[PDB]
Amino acid sequence: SVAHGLAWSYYIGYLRLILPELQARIRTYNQHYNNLLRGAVSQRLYILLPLDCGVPDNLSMADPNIRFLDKLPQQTGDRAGIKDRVYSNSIYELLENGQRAGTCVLEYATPLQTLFAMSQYSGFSREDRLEQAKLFCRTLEDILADAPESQNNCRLIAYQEPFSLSQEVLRHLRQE
Amino acid sequence: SVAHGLAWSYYIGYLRLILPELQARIRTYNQHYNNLLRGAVSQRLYILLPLDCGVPDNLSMADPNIRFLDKLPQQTGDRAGIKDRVYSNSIYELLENGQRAGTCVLEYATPLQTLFAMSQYSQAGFSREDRLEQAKLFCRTLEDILADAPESQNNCRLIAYQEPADDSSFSLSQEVLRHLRQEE
């Protein structure tokens, strides 16, 4: 049940705040900042849900075919006593054969780091961590399916390694 | 178990990251004479834990005697696929009789908003009583986490309070000043 609460926490504390302005920020980037010949940034927030709960800080460290392109225009807002809290979301090019194949706003679901931290060493086994990660994912899918902030503007990317993270994301980008 | 998990998720997801550099950033802010002449910033992160789980976005809206002053210079770092994620931490003056009595880095514990959002509308008997119990468990777990955590080196003060029914009888600025004066 901890992961059910973490999924709610992620929606209430982050996704409900970030999803409503996302379309407008992507449109700003596409119309004002993006070089003439660069491909458009895709319209969705792509959230990585590694079922192993491995959340590295740097996506280019995780797969060099995920290349940092630029920041979205920043979203600021008062939040829980932070005046003008800053959200500096990252845009990535997904490379195939050294060339851009897709461009998107991509990040990991941060609460998966809690499940990982509490099970990295051996109570709370790897199998228990997998079960919590799946519960997180199922709970978050149910929340977003019902949430008025989720309007074809978010895509959950849940995966288990048996692998290219870039190819996993591209399969989701190309399903749209 | 949810409150226990939220306390861990708050330490792992934020306090672990923000606490190690915080005193260096405050020290830097206080070394600017024009800042120090206004008043020294207290050398701790003060975390508000309203046990009702009510977490308004703007502290001056909560209590006009909590006056926004300034921001620490941004801390950036790569986090969970966010390149150079930005932490803009707010500094407040705490007023007594219209005058500065203290200056601090102050914010609400964000996961208390989840406890609240999940029970605000409940028609269950004892939903408010159950929420208060969850909030206390959250605070207890977080106190126990930070007692043991190497990032917590007399640099964090949890401010847990249950507000009275009577809105006018409670002053959040006074609640923070009580803590700020002990930390001194």
Ligand SMILES: O=C(Nc1cc(F)c(F)cc1C(=O)O)c1ccc(-n2ccnc2)nn1
């Ligand atoms: O997951 C986040 N937040 C939370 C998750 C919780 F479960 C919770 F209880 C509270 C929060 C919170 O932030 O208060 C989160 C994720 C990405 C970014 N972000 C993206 C660009 N810059 C910052 N910011 N926050």
Ligand SMILES: O=C(Nc1cc(F)c(F)cc1C(=O)O)c1ccc(-n2ccnc2)nn1
């Ligand atoms: O509580 C926060 N975050 C989280 C809490 C979680 F429970 C979790 F699982 C993940 C996060 C997360 O951020 O990923 C949080 C609070 C303050 C600020 N902040 C202060 C200035 N600018 C930004 N940022 N984040």
